[PDB]
């Protein structure tokens, strides 16, 4: 399964969440941003590695990072 | 707290597209927000974003 | 002389290359009436050839057994033996225009930088100011050096963004 | 006379003598700073890697100034290549 | 086992080695590996 | 469920797709990544793997000797090496038709055979081999050596014989032993073969294992060596009337410095080759006694590296803190090794065409051409690996805090300077080198050859005159006898070097014209560009404005997504992948220049190259098109000849090359969706639905297809050229 | 200091004022590093002393009348004998080379081994028998360094003139005095390009 990590450089925009195609990210409460929100990645077992969230991360570099690793039927998105 | 609104500060963040480059301080959240200094840039990163919230230590007037 | 390169004036192959090349055009002139534009043209090509195949030798162009003029690059060889017109002298000529073009370009770039929206004066070029900076590059070498001996030609290393190592 | 003995003997003698009283102290000083200061100690421990570990017979010479057997086989080796480069050079070249 | 060198191959060696190496040998290797590659864990 | 194929990678082992089978073969010799890998275990595994490669090399060599002896014409070729064609092996093709069986019977045989272009014959003759027994004995010997190394791979992997990491990190000693024993005692040992077997055999006198302990290599014996009168071994050299393998013109010298080449063999003299190995052996042994071991006298490498810091501080901390960097990084060392081996692999090709080191090597044009091209290409692949492993070092094993201010860390500091300056040189070479080819082509098309620009390579001609080339008329150094260098060597190799260099029937310093000037600058463009691609990837291996966390993403990763415009081919694996193409392009130009310069030399039409090469059109019609006339006619509607295999391979190369394009032009997606439709059809098809796949069929990985297409592309470029280089040189 | 290499210039602060012979000449800043400055200073005096001996010997062998500086190691090649002041010395290049090696191998190592960085360039003692240092040594040191910089340059001149003019130092001098404008580096062929 791919590894998704949310760094402290998160602004709680929720854009990466509204971008995940397989419900892998969610918005949990935090205190280091004025939006009092920090995206978490509860179900990285459904991550396909599309990296759509990164294309939706507006912070310098990338607060959300998808490290493509092991590949499974879900990770490879195989309906076979 | 933070560089005066409108002040141009040299970005010190290493992984910043605007490193060694200057930008105007749009605002500085006076709370305990990790990165409070909002800095705007005429140039835009590869993504297309032209702004970013940098920490007080990441900015040098 | 130089590297076994005989002067084209003393190059027999160079002479044959003339004889055979003008014969190949004096055989295409026969299949045409004496006054036809086809023939006026082939006679100009024969005259132009006979002038070039002589302007070259008169310039002391050393050529090998092939009979094709060769050029000398070494400044010492080119200068010492009067072969400066080839490569040597031409070298500076390009360098002057090259630096002229580059200097004028940077002059304009650094003027539009600052000016309002500098990005919209690169697409819709300001032809007036672009025409006031072209001649300024005539004495570019004088101005470029004055900038080296004043530390203004380059930028400080602590103001240029660099990729993470 | 002028047989191989003259050339080989002279070379060996000169190098050994120059390396027993002249460069011997510099040789020792260079060995120390090199192996103790900038260079550290090798063969930390474990395994039959004691082969890389220093021997002992080399560090057993009553010879004053500590001219070890390796030093005698060192300067002498340099000397046996001068005796044979001088004789050989006169042979032809 | 004749002349000088006693290991000079017979004239029929090519008519055996070439067929075996390229048809028989490979089949065994491919089949054996196939089973290992698909071997369950 | 989980499979066992990828034992090292449990992720691949648990992979439900077919990618597990493909990657399992790739990530196989990357132990550093294997599940549960310790540094010591890694070194022990690599050390044993080395033995395995050494077993293959000796087993490979033994096979060549065996087939040359069992199915060859060595004795016949040795009798007439300028008429008989060396036979590599026999063609037992159960598919050959009768005309194929007839046409491939050549070089004196009773069945279809393959002539050899490896040049083993010329080499084995020069070294003393004369009969088929010599080959059989050698093959058995090398086969035994291969068996020994194979046992050693097992022995050094079984507890109590597995070297500790400390032994693997014992550099001072390893270098000392290799330089004195592996390099030196193996050169003096070779002089011992030459002086005792090769030289006597070349003078017609069997000194084999039966009489070597009783045959004096020199008439005087070891007396001159002991008495110091070493000169006695350099008296009575073989006369020009000497015939290799015959006492005719034979002399008595064992070690000399004649220089040049033997008249009949047209190859370096054996005595001069004996004294060379003796001289180099002495240097290697003395050089071996340098680093410190377990006695005392010696140099600690760390001290030398740390003591070399420029006092002006221009190089920062200099080489201080670099010993650990090299000793604790197996990619840094491998890169240096590949760089050194690669460069020397090229020296072998550039010094073996000019100075044939084997008897009757020059005579065999096809061998010469196929040997230059072999090494020059192998060298190029090795060089790509050098930079490749260097980039891996930057990411997998570089500590930015330990290397702080050292020459290695102050390189990334000016990484842009190095990369950008390599860009300017490449553009300058490219814009001009090509512009003066199109300009000449235009003049050729407009029938104005005189107008074409032909710059003279004066700088190279002077280096040639310095060595003694007189054609140019510059009278410089050796060219001027009244000189110091010329007079000094006049009593040694000089008398010969000139005779040989001033003979135009060989390849010692061949006359260069303006055609060579353009191609030489084109070769430079390839060297600089290929370098720029690899250097850029190495410097940006773990850093870049687009991907500042490249080190976190490893070395081989497809892309970072369509984000930031495009991250396609952003991994430092893709600087290698791309550099390979430029490497093939560069070597292509060099091996095409060799072949044409020499085909024109051998056909006697040197003016052909001296003129057609100036313009590019000449390179295609006069070289590729003209020479391809025979190869393509290997099999025509009227019959077939012995060049049929090369014609078939020539086309085969094009096929593999074109197939490589699909994997590079097309990308993973159209194929994936297509595979989905295929999966559906099979599951629905009756009588076929019964049989099913154990592994889910998936399209080739993004990086995988890059290497698969590149392997097809490379294989083509090699087979297509190997066919030309051999069938055009042999056809004449 | 001792003066200014370029009347008007300043700085060379890296070069201390006490340094015997400080005229300020260090354009390429080769003495900035203190360590390098120490070695360069000691080497200069060592070079000066050797240079002064060489220049005197090069002119002496010619002035007294026994040959020239260049044609002196000719005997070892031509196949003759050594000759000091005419007196044939009974040695051969081989024995001379060996005598020199051991002699220099000991004296030079002895000087280098001494670690004072003030007595490694100015040992005095046995090296100052007449004890001339007493009473004032700085001026003598300046004369030693100044006369030596003259000798180091001269020794280069002899080699250069022999390389181009192909004449002995004393003979070349006479040639210049003879026709000054017509016997210079310029009228020689190698010095100037045109
Ligand atoms: C771009 C690189 C380059 C290269 C590869 C060369 C190469 C060469 N140059 Mg040269 N040169 C260059 C740049 C270069 N030059 C530049 C930029 C200048 C302007 C300052 C000169 C000015 C120059 C002169 C005046 C002369 C050469 C000469 C030569 C040739 C012999 C001189 C020598 O030994 O070294 C290279 C020398 C230099 C780079 C400049 C120093 C001038 C040389 C040392 C004087 C030698 C004179 C003597 C006749 C040379 C003997 C050559 C031999 C065949 C007899 C040689 C093939 C000589 C020649 O062959 O012309 C007749 C010579 O006279 N060059
Ligand atoms: C003011 C215009 C300008 C100037 C001064 C330069 C200057 C330079 N360029 Mg560059 N370049 C330019 C435009 C310019 N470039 C443009 C428009 C492109 C896109 C095609 C490039 C693409 C380019 C590349 C790929 C590279 C350079 C490189 C370089 C450096 C190597 C020197 C050289 O040989 O030039 C090289 C110039 C070129 C290769 C192409 C540009 C040539 C154009 C015709 C000149 C620009 C004229 C401009 C339109 C005039 C504007 C006038 C104004 C009134 C409108 C150099 C400092 C090299 C480098 O980075 O060195 C490390 C290099 O790799 N340039
Ligand atoms: C005298 C002592 C000695 C000797 C002879 C060797 C020899 C060797 N060691 Mg070794 N080693 C030693 C001591 C020694 N070692 C010690 C004390 C240590 C402890 C630190 C080590 C630790 C060590 C390690 C960790 C490894 C080796 C390895 C090797 C092998 C290198 C592979 C190779 O093929 O090189 C052969 C190279 C040459 C014979 C000479 C090079 C000449 C160049 C390459 C080309 C010359 C060609 C010539 C000009 C023309 C040829 C024409 C024709 C014949 C084709 C090699 C045979 C490696 C190995 O195991 O490989 C199996 C390796 O992993 N050694
Ligand atoms: C003694 C030389 C040598 C050694 C010991 C290695 C060792 C290694 N290389 Mg390497 N390499 C070399 C030379 C060498 N290389 C050269 C000369 C090149 C230039 C062509 C390369 C280019 C290269 C690349 C691009 C990569 C490696 C990689 C690797 C590592 C894993 C790949 C592997 O070996 O499995 C087996 C490799 C194969 C089976 C190759 C697959 C296709 C080949 C062409 C078919 C050959 C079948 C026989 C491994 C530690 C990989 C790596 O860095 O790991 C992350 C990788 O990305 N190498
Ligand atoms: C015939 C095919 C071909 C050609 C001609 C080139 C040419 C080039 N490649 Mg390249 N390459 C190729 C195939 C090719 N490649 C393939 C198949 C691959 C594998 C994917 C690569 C991968 C590759 C990499 C990784 C790199 C290159 C680089 C380069 C450049 C090297 C620097 C140079 O020489 O500048 C010389 C410039 C020229 C020769 C251009 C000539 C001047 C032009 C044509 C005239 C101007 C236009 C003209 C007036 C009219 C045309 C336009 C008009 C219609 C408007 C060069 C231009 C390097 C690079 O980018 O440079 C920094 C580099 O990094 N290549
Ligand atoms: C760098 C200093 C130096 C060097 C290297 C030489 C070297 C040489 N000189 Mg010479 N010379 C020098 C200074 C020097 N000289 C000075 C300053 C003078 C002026 C007095 C002379 C006057 C002079 C004359 C008149 C002659 C030479 C000659 C020679 C050559 C013959 C050597 C010989 O046979 O006698 C070697 C020396 C000895 C046998 C004994 C002297 C050993 C010294 C004095 C002991 C010093 C010990 C030291 C303090 C501690 C150790 C020789 C190459 C001869 C020559 O070449 O003419 C053909 C010759 O005729 N020199
Ligand atoms: C200051 C500066 C600063 C900046 O920074 C840079 C710059 C400018 C570069 C610098 C400069 C420097 C310099 C000038 C140097 C010089 C050197 C020299 C010349 C030496 C000599 C040196 C020289 C010398 C020693 C000499 C020696 C000699 C001798 C021993 C002896 C000889 C001889 C004689 C008697 C005679 C006889 O018959 C022979 C003989 C025997 C042979
Ligand atoms: C220690 C002691 C102690 C005690 O107590 C005391 C005492 C004894 C006193 C002391 C000692 C001391 C000493 C030894 C000294 C030495 C000196 C010298 C020799 C110098 C030279 C010195 C020398 C020198 C300068 C040199 C110079 C030269 C010159 C200028 C020039 C020349 C020339 C030339 C180029 C060329 C021309 O054509 C000629 C001429 C012109 C001629
Ligand atoms: C004599 C000569 C040649 C000799 C060449 C030789 C021996 C050495 C050449 C060194 C060369 C050509 C260049 C070294 C350049 C190094 C540096 C640091 C110079 C960089 C130039 C810069 C930064 C200037 C850029 C410009 C500025 C700032 C403004 C405008 O001027 C435009 C521009 C871009 C030019 C040969 C090849 C024989 C052939 C015959 C002419
Ligand atoms: C005890 C003592 C002493 C001393 C003595 C002696 C006598 C010493 C010496 C010793 C020695 C005596 C040493 C030596 C060493 C050497 C070596 C150990 C080696 C040798 C050889 C060589 C090195 C050679 C090599 C080679 C060869 C083999 C061949 C050819 C080439 C060559 C030559 C290179 C005295 C008396 C003072 C006193 C006190 C006591
Ligand atoms: C086979 C072959 C090959 C290979 C080779 C190799 C890789 C190795 C070998 C090796 C060898 C096979 C060697 C030999 C050896 C022998 C010996 C080595 C013996 C000797 C004897 C004696 C009697 C001597 C002794 C001694 C010494 C040792 C020291 C000093 C002293 C003395 C002199 C006493 C080739 C490929 C080329 C080809 C052909 C085939
Ligand atoms: C025609 C003859 C030409 C000259 C031939 C001789 C060349 C010069 C000698 C080369 C070998 C030098 O060998 C050695 O060098 C080192 C380096 O300074 C000297 O070392 C000496 O000075 C260094 C300076 O840092 C000190 O650290 C060291 O303690 C001291 O002994 C030795 O005293 C000398 O024995
Ligand atoms: S097209 Fe392929 S290589 Fe390019 S960014 Fe998308 S997934 Fe990556
Ligand atoms: Ca034999």
mmCIF file of N, CA, C and O and ligand atoms in Angstrom, chain F residues 128-131 134 197 201 205-208 210, ligand 14:
data_model
loop_
_atom_site.group_PDB
_atom_site.id
_atom_site.type_symbol
_atom_site.label_atom_id
_atom_site.label_comp_id
_atom_site.label_asym_id
_atom_site.label_seq_id
_atom_site.Cartn_x
_atom_site.Cartn_y
_atom_site.Cartn_z
ATOM 1 N N UNK F 128 52.243 -18.485 -27.798
ATOM 2 C CA UNK F 128 52.999 -19.750 -27.727
ATOM 3 C C UNK F 128 52.237 -20.975 -28.155
ATOM 4 O O UNK F 128 52.892 -21.961 -28.459
ATOM 5 N N UNK F 129 50.901 -20.904 -28.168
ATOM 6 C CA UNK F 129 50.049 -22.061 -28.555
ATOM 7 C C UNK F 129 50.274 -22.369 -30.038
ATOM 8 O O UNK F 129 50.356 -21.410 -30.829
ATOM 9 N N UNK F 130 50.371 -23.653 -30.396
ATOM 10 C CA UNK F 130 50.647 -24.036 -31.807
ATOM 11 C C UNK F 130 49.751 -25.206 -32.231
ATOM 12 O O UNK F 130 49.478 -25.318 -33.441
ATOM 13 N N UNK F 131 49.315 -26.042 -31.283
ATOM 14 C CA UNK F 131 48.525 -27.251 -31.644
ATOM 15 C C UNK F 131 47.139 -27.202 -30.993
ATOM 16 O O UNK F 131 46.881 -26.251 -30.230
ATOM 17 N N UNK F 134 47.344 -27.906 -27.030
ATOM 18 C CA UNK F 134 47.581 -26.688 -26.211
ATOM 19 C C UNK F 134 46.230 -26.093 -25.807
ATOM 20 O O UNK F 134 46.112 -25.623 -24.660
ATOM 21 N N UNK F 197 58.468 -19.215 -22.903
ATOM 22 C CA UNK F 197 57.634 -19.990 -23.873
ATOM 23 C C UNK F 197 57.339 -19.161 -25.129
ATOM 24 O O UNK F 197 57.769 -19.585 -26.218
ATOM 25 N N UNK F 201 58.901 -20.043 -28.772
ATOM 26 C CA UNK F 201 57.918 -20.581 -29.750
ATOM 27 C C UNK F 201 57.940 -19.715 -31.013
ATOM 28 O O UNK F 201 57.906 -20.287 -32.119
ATOM 29 N N UNK F 205 60.817 -23.276 -31.414
ATOM 30 C CA UNK F 205 61.492 -24.148 -30.415
ATOM 31 C C UNK F 205 60.488 -24.498 -29.314
ATOM 32 O O UNK F 205 60.226 -23.625 -28.464
ATOM 33 N N UNK F 206 59.943 -25.719 -29.331
ATOM 34 C CA UNK F 206 58.901 -26.075 -28.337
ATOM 35 C C UNK F 206 59.449 -26.049 -26.915
ATOM 36 O O UNK F 206 60.208 -26.966 -26.573
ATOM 37 N N UNK F 207 59.094 -25.038 -26.122
ATOM 38 C CA UNK F 207 59.461 -25.046 -24.682
ATOM 39 C C UNK F 207 58.145 -25.172 -23.931
ATOM 40 O O UNK F 207 57.606 -24.144 -23.544
ATOM 41 N N UNK F 208 57.606 -26.384 -23.814
ATOM 42 C CA UNK F 208 56.342 -26.615 -23.097
ATOM 43 C C UNK F 208 56.596 -27.198 -21.729
ATOM 44 O O UNK F 208 57.730 -27.122 -21.266
ATOM 45 N N UNK F 210 56.983 -30.098 -20.864
ATOM 46 C CA UNK F 210 57.891 -31.269 -20.963
ATOM 47 C C UNK F 210 59.365 -30.881 -20.843
ATOM 48 O O UNK F 210 60.117 -31.722 -20.361
HETATM 49 CA CA1 LIG H 14 54.246 -25.601 -28.029
#
